[model samples]
Target: MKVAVLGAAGGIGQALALLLKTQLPSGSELSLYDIAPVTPGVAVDLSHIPTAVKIKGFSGEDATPALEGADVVLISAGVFNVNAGIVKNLVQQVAKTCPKACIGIITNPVNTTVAIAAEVLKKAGVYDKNKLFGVTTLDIIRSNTFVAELKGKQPGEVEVPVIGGHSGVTILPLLSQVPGVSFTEQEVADLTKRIQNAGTEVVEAKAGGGSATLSMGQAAARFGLSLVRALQGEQGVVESAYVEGDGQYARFFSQPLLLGKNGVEERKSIGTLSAFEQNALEGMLDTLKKDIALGEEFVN
Candidate 1:
């Protein structure tokens, strides 16, 4: 399979490329594309790792070369703040080049970028609700870790399911549905608040360098690996991803999806919720809908 990483020279992009180089199926072709000239150097550095993955680098306008015939495209390109047209341009490029590829978007304001991607592909007449995804694994990862820490269990042993869109209050960490543990009212409230603000905590700690990078890298890689697995015919590859849909609240919302050979095979509804979760869900629906609208209208 051929995989492409847009903005491959940036912090999250480079880390994601390195992770894919090690974890992607052997003999898979890895293409790294970025606006920066140093992107190709990142590929060259990973190429020396003696892995079976074929690594190539493309920069500038030639990013299309990396995108051509791509089976999966993970777009980490575009500026993070108030750069209105960045995602529209990236989506246009992907639509023109690799329309059939499964796309995992990791851009900031994910609630919007994802809708922009969907709208661009729809305009191109290649929209596939099954194939376009917003990477929101960071919420799930944070939930699992925080719950594990609070419950006195190993992190890896804990599994928490986060639902709703990727944003402040909209990011719902479903503690009641966690596999093995239960939380008191206060505990749940505290943990949920912590998980929701986790991204901002990192951003504040960094003081302005950038948003979360290393954690974003890990989250992006984990989502990418799941996509690779699904493409490789792994059965029952379900994950918490935001995608285009008309569901309970927003036109597009994040929920568990069964990833398959064709992409999102099944969209699982958010299951039963406690009173707190339900209230949180209601409070977030309006904001999530607004975010989705912003992206959908961005390209229009």
Candidate 2:
């Protein structure tokens, strides 16, 4: 399998590439791309890391070479644009180069960018709802860690199902769904806010350095590796991602999905929301709908 990172020179991209380099199978290939001239240097640095995977770098305006024949592409490039033309242009290259490649989007305002990516693929006549995804695993990662901290368990032991869009009030963490764990009303409210504002927490903590690059990189790598493993015929692989919704909420929503060779094998339901979660879901719809509309309108 071959994995490509579009913004290979950026903070998140570098960390993501580093982690993927170590995690991808021995025979795999890692392709890194960035408009910055230092991209090839980044690849050269990663090449000396004693990994079995081959590492290659491509830079400049032409991202086509990096994307060519890629099995999975992770875009950690620029976030939302006023016109969404940035993502549109990149997805165009992906449609032409690797139409079958599973795409994991890590750009910000993902509530909108995933929709934009889907529309671009649709225009290219190769849209696969299952193959297109917004990387929302970070939200799930934070939810799990926070819940585990509160529950006196390891983060790996805690699986919190985070649904809804990937943004402020839109990030809905289902605390009620955690098996063998429970939270009081106050704990629920506090934990919910903490999970929702985790990104901001990182940003403010940085106090002007940058956003959550390291942790975001880990999250993206985790999602990317899961996709790679599933594509390689690994079964029972499941993760939460922002994907085309089945009219369950908005056109694009994130929920737990069963992954397989065909991308999303199954879309799991939110499954019996608690009263508090139900209200949060309702409150999120208006914002999520608008965000989806924004992305659709940008393309149309």
Candidate 3:
């Protein structure tokens, strides 16, 4: 499998490239691209990573060469208002270069940027609903860590399926679905609030920039790994991602998905929701719908 990181010189992109370098299946190739001239240097820096996963980096505005033959494309490109335009342009390149690749977007405002990507792809006539994704794994990662804290178990031991969108109130963790673990109504409310603000927690703790690159890199890499596995023929694989509307809740909601060789094979049900979870899901629709419409408006 060949995976490309669109903004390889950036914080999250670099971390994601490193992780994939050391972790991807042997013989896989990692392609790096950035608007910066440092893209090639980043490749050389990771060149000493001491692994078999091949690495290639390309610089400048054109990402055409780097995207060649990619199986998956993770856009950690710029982060901000202009970032939407950056995603649109890069997605346009992706459509021209490798339209079939699984596209996982880790840029912020995922609630909307995902829709932006979908519209861009659609405009190019290369849209594949199954292959587009909004990488919201960070919320699930945070949910798992927090649930582990209360249960006194490893984070891996706690599997919380965070559904809904990847924004403030749109993030709904089904602590209700967490096996063998239950929280009181108060605990549920508190945990929900924390998960929603976890990004800010990291920012207030130590951030000089807009993007929470480190943790986000890890989460995006986690999502990337899952996508590569499914694309390369791993059966019965499942992960949660913000995908195009699947008749569940809103236009671009995140939910657990069953992955297949063809990208998203099935979107699993949201499952039995607790009263608060149900209400929260209902309450977040307006914001989520607006977010979707905003991106669609941007590209429509």
Candidate 4:
């Protein structure tokens, strides 16, 4: 597997690159690209970690060399400011360079960047809905941790499937659906708030030095491994990811997707929801629709 990181010098990008370099399949190729002049140095530093995977880096205007022949393209690239046009251009470039690779967008405002990436690929006439995913696993990770705290179970042993777009009020955690555990109304409310504000917690803890890099790296790697397992033809590969056009609540919602050798094989139906979950769904639709529309308009 050849995996490319688009913003290989940024906080999330650096963390993701390090995690992937250590965890990716042996003999895999790791290529790093960033607008920063020192990105190659970051790659060199990661290369010293004694991983079997080959590491190469590209900086500034040299991103194409790193992107070429990539099997999986993980893009945390672009400014998080109001400059939405940055992601638009990055998507265009990736569409032109590695149109066949599975593209994962971890950029901020993922609900929008993902739609932008999709639109760029569609214009290029190579858009595959299954292959384009918005990385939203962090929400799931937080939900599982908070719910486990309430249930007196280990966080690793707890599982809660979070669905919807990745953003405040848009993230929906299905607490009622988890097996062998039940959350009270207080638990549900507290867990939802924790999951929604987890990003803020990390950002505040870093005191503006950075955002959630380490945990985001873990979540990104988890999602990446799930995709890899599916690509390697593992049976019943399913994980929650934000993809185009899931019909459970809104268009482009994240849900459990059954992945296969060719990408998303099927989107599983969202089963029964508790009253709290149902109410969360209702509150989430407005913001999610607005977020999705912003991205759609960006490409239009």
Q: Per-model C-alpha lDDT, please?
A: 0.87, 0.90, 0.90, 0.84
- Cα lDDT tens digits for candidate 2, 1-300: 999899889999999999998989899999999888999989999999898999999998888899988989899877455427767888899999999999998887899988889989999999999998999989998998999998999889888999998998999999998999999999999999999989889878889678899999999999999998999999999989999969778888898889999899999887989999999999989999999888888888
Winning candidate number (lDDT): 2
* Distance from true location, Cα of 275 in model 1, Å: 0.7
Each prediction's number of clashing residue pairs: 0, 0, 0, 0
TM for every model, in the order presented, reads 0.96, 0.97, 0.97, 0.95
lDDT per residue for candidate 4 within 1-300, as digits (tens), equals: 888988889888888898988988888899999989888899899999987989988987656788799888888877534546767777777778888888888987988778888888899999999898999998988888877877788999988988888998888888788899877778778888888888999878888776888888889989888888788789798888899865556668888899888788898887888888888889889888888788888889
Error of 3 at 22 (Å): 0.2
lDDT by residue for model 1 over 230-249, one digit each (tens)? 98899988887998765767
lDDT of 3 by residue, 12-113 (tens): 999999899999998899999998998998998887888889998999889999999999999988863797899889999999999999999887789899
TM-score of candidate 1 relative to the true fold: 0.96
Quote model 2's TM-score.
Answer: 0.97
- Residue pairs with backbone overlap in model 4: none
Question: CA lDDT of 76 in candidate 3?
Answer: 88
Candidate 3 clashing pairs, residues 3+ apart or interchain: none
Clashes of 2: 0
True-structure lDDT of candidate 1:
0.87
